[PDB]
Every structure is written in structure tokens, then in C-alpha cells.
């Protein structure tokens with residue numbers, strides 16, 4: 001409570017760096033305790049986002065993202081249960097140049113976190129965390145749910161990619177901490193998107209005709225998103241990310257010729 005609220009404050013001070021590991025680890029432990037009240041924890045994070053300073057607000061966003069990734073699932077479950085999440089579409093800190101330049105990224109980052117919650121609410125699992133492979137969810141899913149789901153991923157991916165940062169804009173510790181988390185989410189989200197396309201192609205011939213048509217439209221949009229992903233990983237390459245962590249895209253885009261199995 002007070003110990004929770006104080007830690008939220010420490011995670012979100014005016015200092016120009018991401019939240020410290022020590023405050024983050026305590027918060028993650030908080031999400032794991034059955035007696036902690038999640039809503040009060042969340043509310044303290046939303047309050048920090050009404051501050052006028054870009055640094056405070058960005059750190060609060062980052063703390064929230066880190067909890068959605070490393071915290072107990074009950075945290076993102078609560079976030080998804082609300083009606084309103086972040087409302088920072090018009091944020092602008094004019095106190096200094098860094099302010100003006102960071103404001104745009106705050107807007108875009110907060111929209112991605114909203115979409116991450118909405119996606120959880122729509123499908124009841126986190127795309128980033130579920131079993132991959134051949135024995136996992138994305139892959140062993142009936143044709144109905146599939147046609148339903150893939151479009152939600154696409155939408156979450158689009159919001160992720162609208163962050164649209166260049167190498168030369170990654171110039172302070174706050175925006176870099178955000179980007180590292182965005183990188184992690186992007187790679188897991190891609191894996192899940194790809195697993196679904198694989199399911200589709202597998203099933204795209206044995207299926208009804210109007211289905212086939214929804215299908216086609218997804219494969220379609222996947223191929224342009226492929227291009228955007230690759231531009232995003234190239235930013236990561238330019239910044240210096242270990243090339244071993246960057247995934248190989250050389251995989252599944254040559255078959256656009258079922259645009260004729262609508263024979």
C-alpha cells in the first residue's frame with residue numbers, strides 16, 4: 001500500500017533514465033502476492049501519467065509495460081477489464097526541447113500499451129507468452145478462431161510499428177528502455193503472427209469459399225507487415241543489438257498463388 005505507492009514513485013522519478021531494476025523487481029513481486037490489491041497499484045501508475053513532465057510520464061508507461069511482460073498475469077487481466085486506459089493522445093511537454101521531441105513518442109507508446117490490453121481482452125491470452133511450436137495455441141487452432149484471431153495480432157503489430165523511431169532519435173536512457181521492451185514484444189508477436197499464417201496455409205485449401213477469401217486478405221496484409229518488420233529490425237541492427245537476438249526472416253512469403261484457388 002504505502003510501500004507499493006512509494007515504490008511506484010521511486011520508479012518514476014524525474015531522473016533521466018529508465019526505472020531502476022530494484023524498484024521493478026519489487027513491483028513484479030507485488031503482482032505475484034495474492035494479498036496485494038492490483039487496482040490500487042494500477043491507479044498509482046495512471047496518476048503518475050497526469051504529471052506534466054515527460055520524464056515522469058514516460059517512466060510510468062515503461063513501468064507498466066515491464067509489469068505486463070514480467071508480472072503475474074493478473075496484472076494485464078485487470079488492465080484489460082477497465083474501460084478506459086491511457087489517455088495521452090494530446091500530451092505535450094513544452095518545457096524544453098527534449099520535451100517536445102519525447103512527447104510524440106509518449107503518444108505513440110501509450111497507444112501501443114492500450115492496444116496490448118485490448119487484445120488481451122478480446123482473445124483471453126497474451127500472444128507473446130503462449131506455447132510456440134507445433135503443440136502450441138497459435139498453431140493448433142481451429143479454422144474458425146484462427147480467422148478471428150490473426151487480425152487482432154495484426155492490429156497489435158501495427159500499433160507497435162507506429163512507434164516509428166529512427167536510430168538517431170534513440171538519444172537518452174528513457175526512450176532507449178522503451179525501445180528494448182518494444183523489441184522484445186515485436187519478436188514474440190512476429191513469431192505468433194507467423195505461426196498463424198502457417199496454420200492458415202496448412203488449412204487454406206480444405207476450407208469454404210468465403211473463408212478462403214478472408215484468408216486471402218490476411219495473407220495479403222501479412223506480406224506488407226513483413227516489410228515493415230524488417231525495417232524495424234534494421235533499426236535494431238543499427239543501434240547495436242546482439243545479432244544473435246534478431247530473428248531470421250527468410251520464411252513463408254512466396255505462395256501468393258492461391259489468389260487463384262478461387263477457381
Ligand SMILES: O=P(O)(O)O[C@H]1[C@H](OP(=O)(O)O)[C@@H](OP(=O)(O)O)[C@H](OP(=O)(O)O)[C@@H](OP(=O)(O)O)[C@H]1OP(=O)(O)O
Nearest residue numbers: 006007008009010011012013015019020021022023024026
Ligand atoms: O538504502 P538502500 O535501500 O541500500 O538504497 C539507498 C537509497 O535509498 P534511500 O533514498 O532510502 O537512502 C537509494 O535507493 P532508492 O531511493 O533508489 O530505492 C539509492 O540511492 P540513490 O537514490 O542516490 O541512487 C541507493 O541504493 P543503490 O546504490 O542500489 O542506487 C542507496 O543510497 P546510498 O548508497 O547513497 O545510501
